[PDB]
Design a protein around this ligand. Structure first.
Ligand code: CLA
Ligand code: CLA
Ligand code: CLA
Ligand code: CLA
Ligand code: CLA
Ligand code: CLA
Ligand code: CLA
Ligand SMILES: CC1=C(C#C/C(C)=C/C=C/C(C)=C/C=C/C=C(C)/C=C/C=C(\C)C#CC2=C(C)C[C@@H](O)CC2(C)C)C(C)(C)C[C@H](O)C1
Ligand SMILES: CC1=CCCC(C)(C)[C@H]1/C=C/C(C)=C/C=C/C(C)=C/C=C/C=C(C)/C=C/C=C(C)/C=C/C1=C(C)CCCC1(C)C
Ligand SMILES: CC1=CCCC(C)(C)[C@H]1/C=C/C(C)=C/C=C/C(C)=C/C=C/C=C(C)/C=C/C=C(C)/C=C/C1=C(C)CCCC1(C)C
Ligand SMILES: CC1=CCCC(C)(C)[C@H]1/C=C/C(C)=C/C=C/C(C)=C/C=C/C=C(C)/C=C/C=C(C)/C=C/C1=C(C)CCCC1(C)C
Ligand code: SF4
Lengths: 732, 90, 30, 107, 34, 101, 108, 162
């Protein structure tokens, strides 16, 4: 009767619905009873300190468990042969064959092999022993304590910031661009120059000696002279053995392009010069806005003045400044969309341009990292559109936004929604038609009648970057060209060496299978965008519910009248787009993984011929690669893939259990539960025990959420077990 | 929902006229349209010359030519300011 | 390698972090 | 034991004539699994001519049933008291339908 | 493993006693009128 | 006494250590572990369900439920202990009666 | 209709009991085989759940010719037991033995 | 909640003190008992086959718990079962771990409760506070010196134990 202390409506519900709804609304502070704007911003500030502390405790735990139970020093000696260890296993349910099967890694106890890549990251940035991994874990424990204390401190009466502080856009932008982005990039350039690069060259540099060991022989003298190019002299030779002094140069800021020939990773001096230049650019960017000294820009003035004089944007951005500042959901939507694009860039650029030593020979780590960050990308993108819908319902005032870009968006929302509908159908009809074309015509024994379109546009982009594989001579590919001649003295030789070796993933060769899967990805993107945009733009109202904004973001329906109104809320458009996000990330990661396992085996022609029809995807990718995974245990024994083999089935179970919540709805279950209430009250020796909360069937929206969670969790667990075990079992 | 703060010196810049008020030029609100137009051409020529002189980039570029090359994008903003001032009668 | 005493130092600092997390959680809870 | 039953042949149009597999007996067609061949051998058919006569008997019965449905709705429709004869209907459907069905088939 | 006794001490506590105690006290908290 | 007595048997015959020579000791400890958990279930139920009043003669009272839990704990330990003594000493009970065949 | 709560609550309990003790045996076996513990499984080579009643009925049906169906010469079906009937070297019918897997899938 | 005698209370002080006094006695006893080799077959490592995978300790060699540690754990199990019974079903005259909630709390002892030579609540608190301090001292000395706790008990007590 008092658990939802933030909601008196839920704390007076006498059913089990009160517990579920109290748990599901806990972080939605804006809707809690008696919430002012002061208190909303101060609780968000403190819980941001608590989230940071959770992130630092997670990082310290990974460092500690690797320092304690890992084989980091043995892996450091021989990184292509040793398999990195994550943490040890202590499970009293294990049989002795299970204990033996998990005792890999060169150790004497059962253990998990790490797929996260933290070994390659920590090796590249300097860590060499277990004792500096342990030093880093104690530093993160200290930082976690500092940020827990700061979160508590800024909830104290004297240290609680005012709303005038929380809405200072110009001071926060100046500090986050020049200090949080720019200066910490400059400090990371310092770490690479002072620690990572010297230890990549055999010289230990730690806190005990870093003040008496110069990064460069000349040493901060070329910097204070303008002889900056003296810092690029003598780069690491192509004979350099990473971690040792043999073949090592003295440069710290050289730009060479391409990959270190032995680690197959970007040069550490390219990375150090990257972070120095990013640091300078971002520090300059962080002096744009006026804070206290009369120079700089007002964000309000810039937004107000950008109305095109032709009038095509209406009033332009007048009033956008206040709309964005007052709406935390608008800020969240912008942040999540930006973050989603970046974690997709991280996934794309980290497989094509790896920065960590000896990674990209860890096919399991490479596959898991790509899959991980694309799924994170899809979740962040769905969340950005969800919080834009919450913005329109809750925070958007049509009268402070008269004839804005926002109001004019809502003014032509049917043009937007119908053209997404057309492009989704246009993509879907023909992409599926060509796939089914090739399927049918290959089935009849005639693969030469397939419709195989060459992806000439992307091949021309690859050639513009210097790929000499398709005989297009435009731009960099030509020996003589202004583009090619301009970069010749700096990065162009190493970039052409990197892009014209078929031994990496830089601009992988593409064909008709890549054309067809790219169009399928485009269809999936435009359809997920359709569902989310339609949810955001119809959130305030539609023709079925012209007053939809009076009911909120998440409500079950408006009843069976007017034909029926199931899934009419904007929340239900989040719900429906979650399936399409899962589908698109499935198509993306299936494509990435099949193309890479065929390349890593040496059999790229298997992808090239089988990817153009759907039976090729079914038998040559799912069916062919399932066999090491589903044989992790069998009536003849078990091996170390037994856990993924169990997770695989586990994933199939949760996913299917989600169907029960998604197909069967409330009325059936409430009537069953009433027969169970009767039976408990009439059974002797059992009616001595009474519920405090009346058992009820789950709510309509809650059941949608539970089915979505079960579906999504089954999706993640099944694919994770497959992508890790099939790549492990094959090693290729 | 609460008053949104802006830095002191914030003024209204919304315009529906032919050209924006000269206040949108900040510290350059009093410069004449002829002076922006001549600065526009000067920055364009000097910036283009300095950019051209270092198109094959070396490990030893002349720092004055690098710094002078930033005059080309700055000239775009200069001719926009010249149009604004000419249409405000300055 | 890591000594058990080093593990015990880590456990002390994590205990201090648990105490600070409880206090922050109580402050947020009001 | 050697020939695989097949009673469906496809036209050659878009390469679909690959479906006419080698089922045996100098024949190409889609293999059928409904067990009609074994029914016909149990009946004692032994020739395609008798299969044509069975096909004609089926067509004549089909014409008589569609005629009976039209006749008994549009020309001579029984009254409700005819349909509400459960004892008579059971007597005829046990004796006449099932009993003489079994006896005639036994013969 | 160094301090090898720690998993056999902490895993039963973290895996059984810790959830058993948070479930017991959460149950008390969610089922109290005041 | 009734519940603790029957609890020992399934744990002993079908538990993980059933084929070991320590099966009965494992069967008793696992049964006792279950009883300790069940006593906690009884205790938490008593705290939430019943408000404090003077009367102690009825089960559906806070004092009465506490008495029921005290009795059930002692009886379950006693019945599990009795089953342990009987199974430890009598070879018919250790098998399913299979000693006769 | 006037005791439909007693009918539906008892059927509901049976369906829960029978999903736990049929599909839960499969989950117990997945877990034991995955953990390396094949002596802890419900199987013929381990803890056995034999279908004794079905096996007994099969025994009676093989004994019936000449015993409880005295004028019959052979069994009603060779699925109950008896010979292997081969036609063109392919098995027509042969005894369908019942074991732990058959106990489990019949309770499924 | 915390009105049942939990938290920092004279009840909690007394109960923790009682356990600490017993703990000091037990540590002295275990140091003496192991020193004279009175723990049977202490060196032997318990077999996983007989005692299950719970026995595993994952050290460098053997990977099984020693018989001595198992015996000491069983002694603690014996007292813990007594403790659970005593909490849920206490003796009539016995003090209770949880209080009724309508109880009148006893006054805090302050720096020094009045000295009573006879067995009394005062003497129990004085000794209990001292023992809790002793447990902290013995652990810290064992940590800083680097010796085992058993040795620290012997060295503090002048090697009387063994
Ligand atoms: C001997 C009498 C007799 C027989 C054979 C049948 C047979 C049938 N009745 Mg019934 N019926 C009877 C008396 C009989 N009825 C009486 C007395 C009443 C009144 C109470 C009804 C009222 C009645 C109703 C209300 C309905 C039927 C229906 C049916 C058909 C059931 C579906 C089926 O199995 O057909 C398939 C099986 C077949 C064998 C197809 C046979 C087709 C013909 C008509 C069977 C008889 C042919 C002939 C006598 C044989 C000549 C043998 C000769 C070569 C020597 C079936 C044709 C149902 C139906 O489908 O209506 C059309 C239905 O709804 N009957
Ligand atoms: C120089 C001063 C400075 C600095 C360093 C910060 C720093 C921060 N502030 Mg800000 N803040 C400042 C001044 C400053 N503030 C001022 C002056 C004000 C008042 C106007 C505020 C008001 C303010 C508010 C109101 C809030 C913050 C918050 C935060 C934290 C943001 C969350 C976070 O950790 O992001 C870290 C971000 C980065 C490290 C950079 C982003 C990285 C991008 C996404 C890509 C990086 C890619 C790169 C390859 C990473 C590789 C990773 C590795 C594994 C390879 C962060 C610690 C929030 C917070 O969490 O509070 C505790 C918050 O709520 N600040
Ligand atoms: C395999 C499963 C599948 C398929 C094919 C589709 C297909 C489609 N969905 Mg659906 N959807 C699915 C699963 C699926 N969805 C699931 C599991 C969910 C989660 C609940 C959703 C949720 C969902 C939402 C919320 C939305 C869609 C939308 C769409 C459309 C997006 C693609 C498009 O625009 O053109 C592709 C067109 C096709 C694939 C049509 C195929 C062409 C047919 C087969 C022609 C064949 C004619 C043939 C002769 C018929 C024979 C009939 C026979 C009796 C004679 C399309 C109709 C969106 C939409 O309608 O926007 C326009 C939309 O808003 N879907
Ligand atoms: C496309 C980008 C862009 C544009 C159009 C402007 C335009 C302008 N800036 Mg801004 N500025 C920019 C990027 C930009 N800046 C960046 C990236 C920074 C960070 C280094 C700054 C930092 C900056 C400061 C610190 C100041 C300006 C000022 C000015 C104004 C001076 C005009 C002048 O020199 O007249 C001749 C002008 C309106 C000045 C001003 O008055 O602002 C209103 C001023 O004080 N700018
Ligand atoms: C509706 C089913 C049906 C039909 C139409 C027939 C029709 C016929 N049967 Mg068959 N019959 C049937 C069922 C049927 N039987 C069944 C179920 C049995 C098993 C008891 C028999 C056993 C049987 C025998 C043993 C004989 C016939 C014979 C005959 C023929 C009769 C000639 C006669 O009267 O002299 C019969 C001879 C006499 C001395 C009297 C005739 C073709 C006779 C025949 O011509 O065989 C080809 C014959 O000998 N029937
Ligand atoms: C894999 C998918 C899946 C699963 C597991 C279930 C499970 C269930 N359904 Mg559902 N259902 C599904 C799909 C599924 N359904 C779909 C797709 C539909 C769409 C039409 C429905 C529609 C539906 C209806 C309409 C009905 C059911 C009913 C049932 C129940 C049957 C009784 C039973 O077996 O209890 C035993 C429970 C199980 C077998 C679930 C698995 C449990 C196993 C044994 C492991 C347990 C592990 C253990 C708890 C772990 C504890 C520790 C952990 C907490 C940390 C059960 C809750 C019926 C019902 O509730 O009546 C009783 C019923 O009327 N379902
Ligand atoms: C009632 C408990 C008790 C008993 C019987 C003893 C007995 C003894 N202790 Mg003492 N000791 C005690 C408690 C006790 N200690 C406590 C609580 C501490 C603090 C942790 C110490 C710290 C201590 C040190 C540091 C030393 C002794 C030493 C000794 C032995 C010779 C010196 C002497 O007469 O001690 C007189 C009493 C004291 C020195 C302290 C009281 C002696 C047998 C000496 C010894 O033999 O060490 C190997 C020695 O150097 N004790
Ligand atoms: C030692 C020991 C045990 C014990 C114990 C206990 C209850 C130890 C309790 C220790 C406590 C509660 C110490 C409190 C310290 C507070 C301080 C010093 C601050 C003052 C200002 C047990 C009973 C488990 C037995 C075990 O075989 C050994
Ligand atoms: C989700 C969540 C909820 C609410 C909001 C929120 C707070 C922001 C958020 C945060 C959650 C967070 C951040 C949760 C953080 C949870 C943490 C950091 C838990 C750490 C626990 C460490 C323990 C119990 C170690 C104890 C070691 C001991 C006793 C060793 C002692 C010793 C040994 C043997 C050796 C030395 C001597 C002695 C002293 C004897
Ligand atoms: C729903 C909703 C309601 C209202 C509020 C809300 C939150 C704002 C909203 C959410 C909206 C959301 C979620 C919006 C999401 C928006 C997103 C994800 C926008 C993606 C933008 C990417 C761009 C413009 C890339 C440009 C790349 C270029 C130009 C590269 C160029 C090139 C270079 C430099 C190099 C290579 C060569 C070429 C190709 C020439
Ligand atoms: C049979 C049957 C036929 C028809 C159908 C049917 C009814 C369903 C079916 C019944 C089936 C069923 C369900 C039968 C169920 C039968 C059951 C569960 C019987 C339980 C008996 C418990 C005993 C004897 C406990 C004794 C404890 C003692 C002596 C205390 C000992 C201790 C104390 C405290 C004192 C100190 C010493 C120690 C040792 C410590
Ligand atoms: S949701 Fe359930 S209730 Fe609301 S309309 Fe659809 S069916 Fe009727």
């Amino acid at each position: 009767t008092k658990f939802p202390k933030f909601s008196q409506a839920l704390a007076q519900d006498p059913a089990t619905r009160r517990i579920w709804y109290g748990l599901a609304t806990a972080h939605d502070l804006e809707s809690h009873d008696g919430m002012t704007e002061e208190n909303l911003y101060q609780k968000i500030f403190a819980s941001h300190f608590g989230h940071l502390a959770v992130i630092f405790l997670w990082t310290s735990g990974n460092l500690f468990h690797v320092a304690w139970q890992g084989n980091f020093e043995q892996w450091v000696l021989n990184p292509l042969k040793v398999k990195p260890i994550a943490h040890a296993i202590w499970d009293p349910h294990f049989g002795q064959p299970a204990v033996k099967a998990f005792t890999k890694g060169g150790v004497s106890y059962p253990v998990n092999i790490a797929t996260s890549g933290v070994y390659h990251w920590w090796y590249t940035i300097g860590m060499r022993s277990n004792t500096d991994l342990y030093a880093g874990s104690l530093f993160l424990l200290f930082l976690a304590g500092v940020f827990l204390f700061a979160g508590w401190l800024h909830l104290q009466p004297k240290f609680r910031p005012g709303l005038s502080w929380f809405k200072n856009n110009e001071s926060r932008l100046n500090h986050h661009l020049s200090g949080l982005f720019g200066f910490s990039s400059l400090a990371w350039s310092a770490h690479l120059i002072h620690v990572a690069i010297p230890e990549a060259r055999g010289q230990h540099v730690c806190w005990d000696n870093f003040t008496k060991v110069a990064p460069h022989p000349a040493g901060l003298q070329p910097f204070f002279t303008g002889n900056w190019g003296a810092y690029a002299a003598s780069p690491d030779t192509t004979n350099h053995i990473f971690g040792t002094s043999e073949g090592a140069g003295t440069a710290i800021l050289t730009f060479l392009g391409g990959f270190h020939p032995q680690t197959q990773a970007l040069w550490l001096t390219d990375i150090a010069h990257h972070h120095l230049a990013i640091g300078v650019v971002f520090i300059f960017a962080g002096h744009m806005y006026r804070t206290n000294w009369g120079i700089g820009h007002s964000l309000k003035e810039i937004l107000d003045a950008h109305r095109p004089p032709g009038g095509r944007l209406g009033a332009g951005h007048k009033g956008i400044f206040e709309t964005l500042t007052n709406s935390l959901h608008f800020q969240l939507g912008l942040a999540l969309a930006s973050l989603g694009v970046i974690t997709s860039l991280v996934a794309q650029h980290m497989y094509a341009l790896p920065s960590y030593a000896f990674i990209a020979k860890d096919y399991v780590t490479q596959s898991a990292l790509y899959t991980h960050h694309q799924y994170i990308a899809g979740f962040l993108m769905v969340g950005a559109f969800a919080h834009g819908a919450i913005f329109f319902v809750r925070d958007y005032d049509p009268e402070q936004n008269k004839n804005n870009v926002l109001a004019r968006i809502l003014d032509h929302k049917e043009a937007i929604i119908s053209h997404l509908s057309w492009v989704s159908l246009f993509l879907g009809f023909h992409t599926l038609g060509i796939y089914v074309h090739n399927d049918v015509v290959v089935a009849f024994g005639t693969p030469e009648k397939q419709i195989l379109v060459e992806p000439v546009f992307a091949q021309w982009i690859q050639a513009s970057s210097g790929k000499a594989l398709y005989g297009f001579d435009v731009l960099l590919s030509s020996t003589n060209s202004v583009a090619a001649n301009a970069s010749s003295n700096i990065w162009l030789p190493g970039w052409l060496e990197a892009i014209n070796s078929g031994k990496n993933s830089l601009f992988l060769p593409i064909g008709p299978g890549d054309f067809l899967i790219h169009h399928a990805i485009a269809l999936a993107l435009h359809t997920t965008t359709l569902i989310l945009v339609k949810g955001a733009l119809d959130a305030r109202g539609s023709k079925l519910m012209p007053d939809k904004k009076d009911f909120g973001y998440a409500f079950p329906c408006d009843g069976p009248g007017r034909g029926g109104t199931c899934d009419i809320s904007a929340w239900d458009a989040f719900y429906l787009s979650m399936f399409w996000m899962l589908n698109t990330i499935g198509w993306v990661t299936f494509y990435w993984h099949w193309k890479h396992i065929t390349i890593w085996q040496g059999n790229a022609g298997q992808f090239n011929e089988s990817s153009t029809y759907i039976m090729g995807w079914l038998r040559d990718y799912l069916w062919l690669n399932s066999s090491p995974l589903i044989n992790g245990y069998n009536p003849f024994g078990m091996n170390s893939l037994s856990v993924w083999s169990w997770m695989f089935l586990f994933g199939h179970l949760i996913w299917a259990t989600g169907f029960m919540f998604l197909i069967s709805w409330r009325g059936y279950w409430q009537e069953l539960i009433e027969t169970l209430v009767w039976a408990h009250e009439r059974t002797p020796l059992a009616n001595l025990v009474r519920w405090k909360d009346k058992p009820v069937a789950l709510s309509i929206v809650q059941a949608r959420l539970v089915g979505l969670i079960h579906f999504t969790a089954g999706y993640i667990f099944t694919y994770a077990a497959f992508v890790i075990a099939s790549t492990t079992g094959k090693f290729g | 929902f609460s008053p949104v703060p802006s830095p002191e010196g914030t003024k209204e810049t919304y315009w529906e006229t032919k050209a924006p008020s000269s206040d949108v030029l900040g510290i350059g609100a009093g410069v004449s349209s002829g002076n922006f137009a001549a600065a526009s051409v000067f920055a364009a020529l000097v910036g283009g010359y300095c950019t051209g002189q270092v198109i094959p980039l070396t490990v030893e570029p002349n720092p004055l030519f690098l710094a002078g090359s930033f005059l080309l994008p700055y000239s775009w903003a200069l001719h926009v300011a010249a149009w604004i001032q000419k249409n405000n009668g300055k | 390698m890591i000594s058990d005493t080093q593990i015990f130092i880590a456990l002390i600092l994590a205990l201090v972090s648990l105490v600070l997390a409880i206090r922050l959680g109580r402050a947020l809870y009001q | 034991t050697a020939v695989k039953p097949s009673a469906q042949v496809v036209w050659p149009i878009v390469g679909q004539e690959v479906l006419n597999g080698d089922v045996g007996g100098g024949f190409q067609g889609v293999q059928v699994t409904s067990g009609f061949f074994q029914i016909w051998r149990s009946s004692g058919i032994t020739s395609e001519v008798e299969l044509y006569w069975c096909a004609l008997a089926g067509l004549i019965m089909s014409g008589l049933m569609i005629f009976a449905g039209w006749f008994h709705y549009h020309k001579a429709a029984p009254k409700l008291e005819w349909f509400q004869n459960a004892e008579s209907m059971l007597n005829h459907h046990l004796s006449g339908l099932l009993g003489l069905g079994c006896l005639s088939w036994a013969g | 493993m160094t301090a090898a006794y720690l998993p056999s001490i902490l895993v039963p506590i973290i895996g059984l006693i810790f959830p058993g105690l948070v479930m017991a006290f959460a149950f008390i908290y969610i089922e109290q009128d005041e | 006494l009734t519940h603790g007595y029957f609890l020992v048997g399934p744990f002993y015959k079908l538990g993980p250590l059933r084929n070991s020579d320590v099966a009965l000791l494992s069967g008793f400890f696992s049964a006792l572990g279950l009883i300790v958990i069940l006593v906690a279930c009884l205790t938490i139920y008593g705290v939430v369900s019943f408000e404090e009043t003077e009367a102690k003669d009825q089960l559906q009272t806070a004092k009465g439920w506490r008495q029921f839990t005290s009795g059930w704990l002692v009886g379950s330990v006693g019945g599990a202990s009795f089953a342990y003594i009987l199974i430890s000493n009598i070879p018919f009970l250790q098998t399913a009666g299979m000693s006769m065949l | 209709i006037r005791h439909r709560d007693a009918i539906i609550s008892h059927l509901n309990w049976i369906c829960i009991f029978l999903g736990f003790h049929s599909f839960g045996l499969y989950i117990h076996n997945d877990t034991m085989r995955a953990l390396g513990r094949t002596q802890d499984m419900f199987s013929d080579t381990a803890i056995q759940l034999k279908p004794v009643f079905a096996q007994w009925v099969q025994s009676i049906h093989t004994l019936a010719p000449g015993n409880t169906t005295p004028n019959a010469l052979a069994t009603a079906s060779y699925a109950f037991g008896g010979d292997v009937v081969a036609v063109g070297n392919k098995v027509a019918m042969m005894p369908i033995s019942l074991g732990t897997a058959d106990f489990m899938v019949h309770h499924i | 909640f915390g009105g049942r005698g939990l938290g920092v209370t004279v009840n909690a002080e007394r109960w923790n003190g009682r356990h600490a006094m017993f703990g000091i006695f037990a540590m002295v006893m275990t140091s003496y008992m192991k020193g004279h080799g009175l723990i049977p077959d202490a060196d032997k490592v318990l077999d996983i086959a007989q005692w299950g995978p719970l026995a595993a300790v994952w050290d460098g060699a053997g990977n099984g718990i020693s018989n001595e540690r198992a015996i000491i754990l069983i002694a603690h199990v014996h007292v813990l079962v007594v403790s659970v019974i005593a909490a849920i079903a206490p003796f009539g005259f016995q003090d209770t771990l949880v209080k009724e909630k309508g109880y009148t709390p006893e006054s805090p002892a302050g720096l020094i409760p009045p000295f009573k030579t006879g067995l009394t609540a005062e003497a129990e608190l004085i000794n209990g506070r001292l023992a809790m301090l002793g447990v902290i001292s013995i652990v810290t000395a064992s940590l800083f010196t680097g010796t085992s706790v058993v040795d620290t008990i012997n060295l503090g007590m002048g090697k009387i134990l063994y």
